[PDB]
Amino acid sequence: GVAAIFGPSHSSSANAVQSICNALGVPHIQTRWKHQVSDNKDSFYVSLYPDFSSLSRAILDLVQFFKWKTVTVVYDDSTGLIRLQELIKAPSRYNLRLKIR
Amino acid sequence: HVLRFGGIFEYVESGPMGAEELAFRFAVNTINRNRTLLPNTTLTYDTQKINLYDSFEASKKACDQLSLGVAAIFGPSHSSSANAVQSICNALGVPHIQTRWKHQVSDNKDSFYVSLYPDFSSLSRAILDLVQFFKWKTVTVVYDDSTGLIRLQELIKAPSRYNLRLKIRQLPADTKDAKPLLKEMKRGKEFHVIFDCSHEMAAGILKQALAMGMMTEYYHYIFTTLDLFALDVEPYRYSGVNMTGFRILNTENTQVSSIIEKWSMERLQAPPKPDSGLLDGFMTTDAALMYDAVHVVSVAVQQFPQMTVSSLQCNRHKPWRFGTRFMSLIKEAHWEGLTGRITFNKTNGLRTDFDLDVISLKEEGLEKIGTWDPASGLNMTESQKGKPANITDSLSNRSLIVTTILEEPYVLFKKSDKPLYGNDRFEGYCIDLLRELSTILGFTYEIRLVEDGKYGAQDDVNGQWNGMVREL
Amino acid sequence: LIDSKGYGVGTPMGSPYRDKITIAILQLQEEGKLHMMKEKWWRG
Numbered sequence: 107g108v109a110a111i112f113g114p115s116h117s118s119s120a121n122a123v124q125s126i127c128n129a130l131g132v133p134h135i136q137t138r139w140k141h142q143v144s145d146n147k148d149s150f151y152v153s154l155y156p157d158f159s160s161l162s163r164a165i166l167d168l169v170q171f172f173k174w175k176t177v178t179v180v181y182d183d184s185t186g187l188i189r190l191q192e193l194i195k196a197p198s199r200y201n202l203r204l205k206i207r
Numbered sequence: 208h209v210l211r212f213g214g215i216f217e218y219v220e221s222g223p224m225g226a227e228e229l230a231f232r233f234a235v236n237t238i239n240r241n242r243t244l245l246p247n248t249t250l251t252y253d254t255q256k257i258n259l260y261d262s263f264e265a266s267k268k269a270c271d272q273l274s275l276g277v278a279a280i281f282g283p284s285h286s287s288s289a290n291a292v293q294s295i296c297n298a299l300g301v302p303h304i305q306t307r308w309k310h311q312v313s314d315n316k317d318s319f320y321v322s323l324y325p326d327f328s329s330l331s332r333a334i335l336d337l338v339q340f341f342k343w344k345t346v347t348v349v350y351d352d353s354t355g356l357i358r359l360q361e362l363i364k365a366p367s368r369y370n371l372r373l374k375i376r377q378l379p380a381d382t383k384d385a386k387p388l389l390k391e392m393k394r395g396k397e398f399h400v401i402f403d404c405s406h407e408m409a410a411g412i413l414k415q416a417l418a419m420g421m422m423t424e425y426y427h428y429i430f431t432t433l434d435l436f437a438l439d440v441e442p443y444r445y446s447g448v449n450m451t452g453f454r455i456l457n458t459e460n461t462q463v464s465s466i467i468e469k470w471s472m473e474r475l476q477a478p479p480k481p482d483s484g485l486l487d488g489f490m491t492t493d494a495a496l497m498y499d500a501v502h503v504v505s506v507a508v509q510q511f512p513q514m515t516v517s518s519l520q521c522n523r524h525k526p527w528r529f530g531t532r533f534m535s536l537i538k539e540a541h542w543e544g545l546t547g548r549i550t551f552n553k554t555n556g557l558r559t560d561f562d563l564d565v566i567s568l569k570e571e572g573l574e575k576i577g578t579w580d581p582a583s584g585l586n587m588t589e590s591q592k593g594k595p596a597n598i599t600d601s602l603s604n605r606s607l608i609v610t611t612i613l614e615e616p617y618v619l620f621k622k623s624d625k626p627l628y629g630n631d632r633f634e635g636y637c638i639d640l641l642r643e644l645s646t647i648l649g650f651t652y653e654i655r656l657v658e659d660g661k662y663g664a665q666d667d668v669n670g671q672w673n674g675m676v677r678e679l
Numbered sequence: 680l681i682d683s684k685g686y687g688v689g690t691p692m693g694s695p696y697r698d699k700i701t702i703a704i705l706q707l708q709e710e711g712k713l714h715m716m717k718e719k720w721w722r723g
């Protein structure tokens with residue numbers, strides 16, 4: 107008999123807990139970002155981690171303020187490519203060249 | 208004895224069953240009829256149909272099947288349910304089979320699973336080798352799904368080590384809005400496009416690009432999907448479009464063609480969409496992958512005579528007594544099936560060593576042009592025959608825009624009382640040359656005057672041009 | 680004649696038709712119809 111679930115941080119376990127809370131009608135709280143399936147029918151969860159589309163637009167705003175032309179982007183895991191897609195597709199909108207390692 | 212195989216599939220809302228479930232039952236029936244493999248064992252199947260992205264439903268049906276007693280679970284397609292039933296299968300020692308590719312976290316320690324989709328590291332290296340063969344410099348990469356960017360990692364890593372310029376664009380979430388994306392493609396001279404989507408989305412994009420007039424000989428398309436031979440290519444056949452794709456179903460074999468023609472009779476009971484731009488009767492990649500999955504699992508069953516069906520529970524987590532030996536027999540299996548060579552990696556358990564048939568579109572239709580392997584790399588079957596003297600019938604049917612300037616006896620304005628409209632509105636030397644060139648090559652042509660009225664020279668201030676040169 | 684420039688056809692950069700139009704102009708120049716088209720307009 108819990109009233110809400112503060113779920114885990116890893117994305118697969120959080121997806122399983124989110125599907126369980128969606129099926130049982132229980133609120134689910136997320137504190138770390140997970141990559142979201144674009145056509146999921148889930149509506150019973152919230153996430154207080156800041157959305158990386160807005161944070162990547164902030165990154166692009168900072169790049170345009172610092173007036174750069176060649177930018178090397180370095181991540182750690184594969185999911186960072188999902189986490190920085192707005193910066194990745196930002197070429198052919200502005201005069202920005204990306205080298206990605 | 209008997210042996211139960213459990214399959215989780217997508218629940219069709221109304222109509223016939225899916226291609227994966229039908230290919231699963233066809234594989235079960237074809238193994239159960241032919242006594243070439245497993246003569247003393249007859250296999251039975253249980254299918255559960257679930258919705259999309261309901262991993263709780265997937266785990267519940269997997270627990271129901273494991274309470275029934277299943278030797279090996281053929282899992283679902285979409286990523287979250289596949290990861291949930293992968294954790295279910297690795298928790299209880301039950302083998303798990305993947306047909307569609309999913310993204311796995313590299314720090315996951317699960318090992319009771321194999322996959323038959325080709326790894327996108329090897330597919331990305333194949334696309335990079337094809338691009339390096341074609342000698343490109345500016346590549347526009349169009350991707351549909353946000354998880355699909357993981358499938359094209361090495362293309363993004365390529366400008367770090369090579370000389371290349373990428374422009375990465377995302378398709379809209381709406382299916383039919385490829386028109387503003389292709390309008391963005393027409394600006395900026397995007398000529399070499401690599402598409403990364405499903406073949407249905409590829410058919411819709413090709414229809415929307417034919418409607419926008421992008422089916423020319425300027426553009427080159429590379430499709431990363433593995434079922435481009437199933438695409439309808441009848442309006443695009445004589446358009447002269449540079450188009451290259453990959454095949455994994457070696458359809459030139461007699462057994463493969465006979466299995467395709469036998470499965471097409473079961474397919475024609477399911478009504479398809481004949482106006483969707485899809486060629487009829489060709490098997491998809493995932494159906495043949497599930498057929499080869501059932502076949503290689505029966506191969507691994509054949510070398511284990513002590514295989515007994517044992518029920519397992521989900522409330523406790525008692526491991527299965529036959530898990531390790533059967534998983535080692537699955538990972539050491541090796542079979543020539545519908546996708547050619549089938550082997551597994553000793554570390555990841557992913558299909559990373561295979562054969563690929565590099566095909567392309569010509570004026571007679573789709574045809575194989577080369578072979579790709581992870582060991583030998585690319586191997587292009589060389590073709591340079593010569594004798595180009597049939598240029599009279601070359602450029603037979605291409606609408607062509609000719610732009611002139613209204614001065615000089617080269618381009619003379621016609622003088623008559625009746626104001627006619629068309630290509631014979633003008634006279635002179637250049638109109639005579641255009642008439643002779645349309646007599647030789649035979650192309651349909653039209654003449655539109657240059658609105659600037661200038662020949663064309665480089666503006667030294669802004670770097671721009673004007674007239675015919677900027678209009679070209 | 681100060682210079683010795685030439686009059687070609689205006690093709691875009693990397694056009695597929697340019698080699699075929701080059702050998703088409705060569706085949707038309709071999710048959711002498713270019714000379715007849717020159718001799719049909721430059722007189723008065």
Ligand SMILES: *[C@@H]1O[C@H](CO)[C@@H](O[C@@H]2O[C@H](CO)[C@@H](O[C@@H]3O[C@H](CO[C@H]4O[C@H](CO)[C@@H](O)[C@H](O)[C@@H]4O)[C@@H](O)[C@H](O[C@H]4O[C@H](CO)[C@@H](O)[C@H](O)[C@@H]4O)[C@@H]3O)[C@H](O)[C@H]2NC(C)=O)[C@H](O)[C@H]1NC(C)=O
Binds near residue numbers: 424449567695
């Ligand atoms: C995709 O579409 C193209 C055309 O629609 C098909 O044909 C290819 O066309 C390109 C360009 O014509 C061929 O590229 C080769 O480039 C070589 C070096 O490039 C220099 O020269 C060119 C002018 O040719 C300049 O524009 C450029 O800036 C460089 O300065 C040339 O040397 C090649 O010519 C050689 O081959 C011909 C024919 O064999 C000989 O007669 C010449 O003497 C010379 O040796 C050529 O231009 C490319 O090779 C063409 N491909 C093929 C297979 O022939 C593509 O085939 C098509 N692809 C697909 C998959 O459909």
Ligand SMILES: *[C@@H]1O[C@H](CO)[C@@H](O[C@@H]2O[C@H](CO)[C@@H](O[C@@H]3O[C@H](CO[C@H]4O[C@H](CO)[C@@H](O)[C@H](O)[C@@H]4O)[C@@H](O)[C@H](O[C@H]4O[C@H](CO)[C@@H](O)[C@H](O)[C@@H]4O)[C@@H]3O)[C@H](O)[C@H]2NC(C)=O)[C@H](O)[C@H]1NC(C)=O
Binds near residue numbers: 559
């Ligand atoms: C089970 O799974 C693992 C994990 O993927 C596989 O291990 C990888 O196997 C692939 C191919 O089988 C390897 O990919 C290759 O990359 C090489 C470059 O990486 C080099 O990097 C630096 C230099 O920058 C070196 O210090 C380093 O030692 C590596 O050599 C290429 O050299 C390979 O071949 C290519 O050679 C040239 C280009 O140089 C061209 O002819 C071709 O493009 C050709 O492809 C190849 O591309 C990869 O390195 C392996 N390791 C990892 C960690 O990913 C196992 O092979 C697999 N088991 C199987 C299949 O049995």
Ligand SMILES: *[C@@H]1O[C@H](CO)[C@@H](O[C@@H]2O[C@H](CO)[C@@H](O)[C@H](O)[C@H]2NC(C)=O)[C@H](O)[C@H]1NC(C)=O
Binds near residue numbers: 570571600604
């Ligand atoms: C456009 O031109 C091509 C020729 O380049 C036509 O292709 C021919 O089509 C007929 C009918 O199937 C075939 O029998 C010929 O063998 C084809 N010839 C070549 C060289 O491909 C094509 O039909 C034309 N399109 C239309 C609508 O007429």
Ligand SMILES: *[C@@H]1O[C@H](CO)[C@@H](O)[C@H](O)[C@H]1NC(C)=O
Binds near residue numbers: 586587
């Ligand atoms: C390419 O394929 C042909 C066809 O079998 C083969 O004879 C040839 O050895 C191959 N070449 C390479 C480099 O793999």
